[PDB]
Amino acid sequence: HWGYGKHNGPEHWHKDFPIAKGERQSPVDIDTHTAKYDPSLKPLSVSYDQATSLRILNNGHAFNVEFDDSQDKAVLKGGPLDGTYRLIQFHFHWGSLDGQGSEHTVDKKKYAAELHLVHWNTKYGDFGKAVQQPDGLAVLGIFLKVGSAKPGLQKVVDVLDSIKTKGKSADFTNFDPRGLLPESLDYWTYPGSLTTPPLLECVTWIVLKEPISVSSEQVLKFRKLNFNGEGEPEELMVDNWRPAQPLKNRQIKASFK
Numbered sequence: 001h002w003g004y005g006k007h008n009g010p011e012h013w014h015k016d017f018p019i020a021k022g023e024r025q026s027p028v029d030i031d032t033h034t035a036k037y038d039p040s041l042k043p044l045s046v047s048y049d050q051a052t053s054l055r056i057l058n059n060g061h062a063f064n065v066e067f068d069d070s071q072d073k074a075v076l077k078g079g080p081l082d083g084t085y086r087l088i089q090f091h092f093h094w095g096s097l098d099g100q101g102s103e104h105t106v107d108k109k110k111y112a113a114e115l116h117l118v119h120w121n122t123k124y125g126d127f128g129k130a131v132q133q134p135d136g137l138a139v140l141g142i143f144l145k146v147g148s149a150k151p152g153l154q155k156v157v158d159v160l161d162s163i164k165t166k167g168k169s170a171d172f173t174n175f176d177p178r179g180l181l182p183e184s185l186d187y188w189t190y191p192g193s194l195t196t197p198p199l200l201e202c203v204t205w206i207v208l209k210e211p212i213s214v215s216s217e218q219v220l221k222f223r224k225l226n227f228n229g230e231g232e233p234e235e236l237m238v239d240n241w242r243p244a245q246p247l248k249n250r251q252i253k254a255s256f257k
């Protein structure tokens with residue numbers, strides 16, 4: 001099964017998922033000098049006030065905080081998007097060391113981690129239908145650097161002990177994802193894909209320019225999670241990131257000068 005090890009990692013994924021070598025794969029390096037300001041891009045609208053978190057799951061690849069997406073409660077609109085996209089889950093990718101972990105890079109710089117807030121286009125009715133469409137998902141990507149703690153992350157950090165191993169879940173209600181956002185919503189955007197199998201080319205990527213700061217202790221706790229199930233040999237959940245993929249025939253657009 002695919003993963004992040006030497007014998008099942010990103011360089012192997014194309015054998016089961018040939019779209020891994022496709023025309024709009026993610027992540028990519030964001031070359032800040034080549035991204036063009038697009039004055040027709042609108043401000044992002046992030047409307048998370050009525051978000052209903054439900055559960056946190058270790059799925060063997062990351063941990064996902066899942067939301068009730070059966071109504072328009074937490075939605076992303078505006079920016080490059082047409083229509084309304086509903087928040088379904090968020091998760092992170094992170095490194096074994098503070099010098100790596102993000103999937104997107106900025107002028108080849110790797111951040112310590114990257115947050116993905118995953119939303120699906122309500123015109124397709126459900127997430128499974130949306131991933132079959134070129135405009136089915138919008139993923140809001142936020143970089144994490146190590147410095148001061150992020151207060152709004154701590155409730156996530158403190159439940160990770162209860163979902164150490166693959167397949168474990170825990171109740172995770174009343175979590176407010178607004179506490180994970182930076183001050184500015186300036187962003188880069190481009191068309192891409194899921195960054196794990198099935199690698200479907202269904203994502204409008206919206207990557208915020210401003211990172212959030214998390215503490216060394218917060219990210220150290222991410223690194224105590226396990227890829228393995230309970231009662232299996234312990235393999236720390238670290239370096240669960242895909243490296244940058246060829247940009248090919250795409251342009252990255254900036255919302256800001």
Ligand SMILES: O=C1Nc2c(Cl)cccc2S(=O)(=O)N1
Pocket residue numbers: 099107108109110111
């Ligand atoms: O600014 C840069 N940051 C890097 C990081 Cl964070 C990791 C690897 C390579 C680079 S880089 O040297 O290409 N230039």
Ligand SMILES: O=C1Nc2c(Cl)cccc2S(=O)(=O)N1
Pocket residue numbers: 116117118137139193194195196197198
């Ligand atoms: O690793 C990732 N896997 C995803 C899956 Cl499986 C579903 C949707 C969005 C993502 S993601 O591209 O945001 N990052």
Ligand SMILES: [Zn+2]
Pocket residue numbers: 091092093116195
């Ligand atoms: Zn992701």
